[PDB]
Design a protein around this ligand. Structure first.
Ligand SMILES: [Ca+2]
Ligand SMILES: [Ca+2]
Ligand SMILES: [Ca+2]
Ligand SMILES: [Ca+2]
Lengths: 87, 87
């Protein structure tokens, strides 16, 4: 049970799974998730994922609460930091 | 009435008690709680403890709301910062 971020549409390409927490760009990069590269994600039922356009949970924020095969053009390849809640 | 963090399993070893607040690594170190050393903890009923893998409330976050004699292998010896709420 985790959030999995995918590099291409429809859960294709490289993928990394994360547990709840508040992840800066530095931490994403260590977890092998590159800057501005997230296109789809799987979110466990009851969890919340707050994707931020800029580092340290700033800039525009997109919220996902279910599996999302396509984040849309505005949010695509924009993730630089992310907060994940098991709520 | 406080949260007490223990260095070994089943509330054994060195222990430090803290009141609600948001504690960075620096502050934990001053309170005599070393980095990456927490294995069990006591949480007062109604309180919440958010344990963070990295400093300044970032990285993976584990949540405890009751006495926990064993934090588990993934969370063991990982506390670098912590938020404690009397709620
Ligand atoms: Ca991509
Ligand atoms: Ca970005
Ligand atoms: Ca320990
Ligand atoms: Ca740590």
């Amino acid at each position: 049970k985790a959030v999995t971020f995918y590099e291409d549409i429809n859960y294709g390409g490289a993928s990394v799974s994360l547990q709840p927490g508040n992840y800066t760009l530095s931490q994403l990069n260590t977890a092998k998730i590159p800057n501005d590269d997230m296109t789809s994600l799987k979110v466990p039922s009851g969890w919340t994922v707050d994707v931020y356009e800029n580092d340290n949970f700033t800039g525009t924020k997109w919220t996902y609460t279910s599996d999302t095969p396509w984040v849309g053009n505005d949010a695509n390849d924009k993730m630089t930091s992310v907060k994940i809640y098991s709520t």
